[PDB]
From a paper:
Escherichia coli NleB1, Citrobacter rodentium NleB, and Salmonella enterica SseK1/3 type III effectors fatally glycosyltransfer N-acetyl glucosamine (GlcNAc) from UDP-GlcNAc to arginine residues of death domain-containing proteins that regulate host inflammation, intra-bacterial proteins, and themselves, whose post-translational modification disrupts host immune functions and prolongs bacterial viability inside host cells. All NleB/SseK orthologs have a typical GT-A conformation with two abutting β/α/β Rossmann domains unlike a GT-B consisting of facing each other β/α/β Rossmann domains with a flexible linkage and share a high degree of structural similarity. Several structural cores were revealed for the new arginine N-glycosylation systems: a catalytic DxD motif to position the Mn2+ cofactor and UDP-GlcNAc donor substrate, His-Glu-Asn (HEN) motif to select UDP-GlcNAc as a suitable donor substrate before other sugar donors such as UDP-Glc/Gal, C-terminal loop to stably embrace the UDP-GlcNAc donor substrate, and Helix-Loop-Helix (HLH) domain predicted to select the acceptor targets. The SseK1 effector GlcNAcylates Arg9, Arg190, Arg160, and Arg149 of four proteins involved in methylglyoxal detoxification, namely, GloA, GloB, GloC, and YajL, respectively, and catalyze methylglyoxal detoxification to significantly enhance their activity.
All N-glycosylated NleB/SseKs form a Type-I-turn in the DxD motif in the ligand-bound state, and the pathogenic NleB1/SseK1/3 toxins also retain Type-I-turn in the DxD motif in the apo state. All solved N-glycosyltransferase NleB/SseKs structures were revisited to analyze the characteristic topology of the catalytic DxD motif and this analysis was extended to all structures of O-linked bacterial glycosylation toxins to determine whether these DxD motifs follow the characteristic topology. This revealed that in all ligand-bound N-/O-glycosylation toxins, the backbone of the DxD motif forms a Type I β-turn, in which the four residues (labeled i to i + 3) specifically form a pseudo-cycle C10 H-bond network between the backbone CO(i) and NH(i + 3) groups, and that the first aspartate binds with its next-but-one tyrosine, named as the YD bond, which allows the DxD motif to optimally bind Mn2+ and the donor substrates. In all apo- and UDP-bound NleB1/SseK1/SseK3 effectors, the DxD motifs lie in the 219YLDADM224/221YLDADM226/224YLDADM229 regions and their quaternary DADM motifs form a Type-I-turn by H-bonding between the backbone CO(i) and NH(i + 3) groups, while the free Asp oxygen (Oδ of Asp221/Asp223/Asp/226) in the DxD motif interacts with the hydroxyl oxygen (Oη of Tyr219/Tyr221/Tyr224), named as a YD bond.
Numbering used by the authors: 28 to 180, 183 to 333
């Protein structure tokens, strides 16, 4: 029931009904046909295949696909066909979800940082940053002053949005009116998995430290948390909110590292003095029926 790293933390359990989430954002939506699925299934990176094998095993659980891009009408009929083929699979589109509660004008972020740096003496200020901040503020003369819109290219286009979907979590399926959603409530969460994370066998009920757990891709001795696997027990889990606060306050903040990785370290007060490897062990989404980071022994779907 309870675990610990620096204090006693309440391990949380997840109804197998806990849904799983896959995300595909395609910049060139034309590289594929205008009647077949706009998801990549290369012999080097078979993602739609992996997202379909996963659905076949956890049929009881819901499996969803958060997708975005200027797709063709025939490509839309294609996802609907997957929805008919598998009731397990529900495809959600960024256009059908409101993230307005998760946003902050780019203007404020800069002016707040500018005020803070201005307060301190000029000796203690960061001239470079204030220069960067003042330049960027003027260059938002374009009508768009929204952190969300700013995150529209493609690394950011999806990273920030992956975090925003997990902030909604189970609320995402409900907000999108995903039929077949007759096993989940509103505080439900969802487990995010890169599509190159292969589900060898049903995971079943899981236990996540302090109601949260994330994949940790350790290297030579060193270990690093990853946003490839995001397991939350409740929608709007507070670690993600801490990362959203970093997006709200920090300038040039990386959604991947400041949005989740740095947000998790605040929720558990890593403290730096404490060993990071063990803390990564403590946070580590562990599983034996999941093949983690397969693009790795094959190839990265992204040029960038
Ligand atoms: O055009 C792209 C490329 C990647 N992804 C997402 O990013 C994940 C990571 O892909 P991959 O494992 O190939 O990259 P890497 O592990 O090298 O970061 C994929 O599973 C997708 O969910 C996406 O949505 N669109
Ligand atoms: Mn990968």
């Amino acid at each position: 029931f309870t675990s610990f790293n620096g204090k006693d933390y309440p391990l949380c359990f997840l109804d197998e009904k806990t849904p799983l989430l896959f995300q595909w954002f395609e910049r060139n939506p034309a590289r594929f046909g205008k009647n077949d699925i706009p998801i990549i299934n290369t012999e080097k990176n078979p993602y739609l295949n992996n997202i379909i094998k996963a659905a076949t095993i956890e049929k009881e659980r819901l499996i969803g696909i958060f997708v975005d891009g200027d797709f063709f009408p025939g490509q839309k009929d294609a996802f609907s066909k997957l929805e008919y083929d598998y009731e397990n699979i529900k495809v959600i589109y960024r256009n059908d979800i409101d993230f307005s509660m998760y946003d902050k004008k780019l203007s404020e972020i800069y002016m707040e940082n500018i005020s803070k740096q201005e307060s301190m003496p000029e000796e203690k200020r960061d001239c470079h940053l204030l220069q960067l901040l003042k330049k960027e503020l003027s260059d938002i003369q374009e009508g768009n002053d929204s952190l969300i819109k700013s995150y529209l290219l493609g690394h950011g286009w999806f990273d920030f949005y992956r975090n925003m979907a997990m902030l909604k979590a189970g609320q995402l399926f409900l907000e999108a009116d995903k039929v077949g959603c007759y096993d989940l409530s509103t505080n439900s969460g969802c487990i995010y998995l890169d599509a190159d994370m292969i589900i060898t066998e049903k995971l079943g009920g899981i236990y996540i430290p302090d109601g949260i757990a994330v994949h940790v891709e350790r290297i030579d001795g060193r270990a690093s948390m990853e946003n490839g696997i995001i397991a939350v027990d409740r929608n709007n889990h507070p670690a993600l909110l801490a990362g959203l606060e970093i997006m709200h306050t920090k300038f040039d903040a990386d959604p991947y590292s400041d949005g989740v990785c740095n947000g998790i370290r605040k929720h558990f007060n890593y403290s730096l003095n404490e060993d990071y490897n063990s803390f990564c062990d403590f946070i580590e989404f562990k599983h034996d029926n999941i093949i983690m980071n397969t693009s790795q022994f094959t190839q990265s779907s992204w040029a960038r």
